Amino acid sequence: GSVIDPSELTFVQEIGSGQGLVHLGYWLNKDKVAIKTIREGSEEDFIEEAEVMMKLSHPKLVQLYGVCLEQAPICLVFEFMEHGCLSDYLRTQRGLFAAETLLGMCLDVCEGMAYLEEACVIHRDLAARNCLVGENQVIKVSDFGPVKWASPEVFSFSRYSSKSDVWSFGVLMWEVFSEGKIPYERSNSEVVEDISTGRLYKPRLASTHVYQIMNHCWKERPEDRPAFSRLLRQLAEIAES
Ligand SMILES: CCC(O)(CC)c1cc(OCCN2CCOCC2)c2cc(-c3n[nH]c4ccsc34)[nH]c2c1
């Protein structure tokens, strides 16, 4: 449920565009909220996506205050993340990050993805643009309810699983260590031939052990790729050593 009347919401500033629109605002003139308004060209699937997200609780997953369904265009009321999306945050603060901080960002995404893996929830579009930065550089996964991030099963047969998200996490790991760089920059049809031949280059900030995990995520077979539960302890071992 969690229905919010449009009078309870106050629109302050437009922060995002495309997709639909992201606005900075206030709910009941008290809480800083991120209002995600739908674009003209589905209303039912948009409301369904929020209901799934409201039933999944993890410190590394974005939380919703409620939904505004009364007036069209409809909108979802999210908790405001101070530092925006991960993809933009990495590019703006480029050259200021340490390898320890970048691995910590990857561990935050892996924590939320391990919870979704156990709950049998598949994130069909896992990328740095779909991750948010909050207080004290904490990373939260968003929109859990684009051939560059897609696995061979996805771009050829549309087979979605938790192991296909592992591939997307591998590309996400590349985006973090390269400090917000665009993967395969190169059309979607051209990227298919490069992946099928048998990958993304090793970023300067990423070590041999970090890049080894990225290739484990980039395995041709889904069964060869490690599970998010295994990846979490694997990434934690690198942080200690
Ligand atoms: C105003 C402060 C700041 O510019 C960071 C310096 C910012 C910007 C934000 O939007 C970035 C634009 N993207 C464009 C791509 O689609 C997502 C939004 C966002 C978006 C959020 C946000 N917080 N919570 C949620 C949930 C979905 S988006 C979002 N917080 C933001 C903060």
Indicate if 75 and 115 belong to the same structural domain: no
For ligand 1, whether the C-beta of 84 sits within 6 Å is yes
**H helical segments located in 95-227:** 99-118, 152-157, 162-177, 188-197, 208-217
Q: Resolution in angstroms, to 1 decimal, for this deposition? A: 2.6
Indicate if 104 and 160 belong to the same structural domain: yes
Tokens 């999210």 belong to residue: 78
Cβ-Cβ contacts under 8 Å for 6 (sequence gap 6 or more): 68, 70, 71
Please state, in angstroms and rounded to a whole number, the distance separating the CA atoms of residues 237 and 231: 10
Q: Which domain holds residue 240?
A: 83-241
Indicate if 78 and 93 belong to the same structural domain: no
From the CA atom positions of the chain, what is the Rg in Å?
18
End-of-domain residue from the set 82, 108, 138: 82
Domain count across the chain: 2
For ligand 1, whether the C-beta of 24 sits within 6 Å is yes
Indicate if 53 and 111 belong to the same structural domain: no
**Residue 132, H or E segment:** strand 131-133
Q: Which CATH number do you get for residue 166?
A: 1.10.510.10
Indicate if 139 and 201 belong to the same structural domain: yes
End-of-domain residue from the set 54, 82, 110: 82
Is there a catalytic annotation at residue 5? Answer: no
76 CA distance to ligand 1 centroid (A)? 13
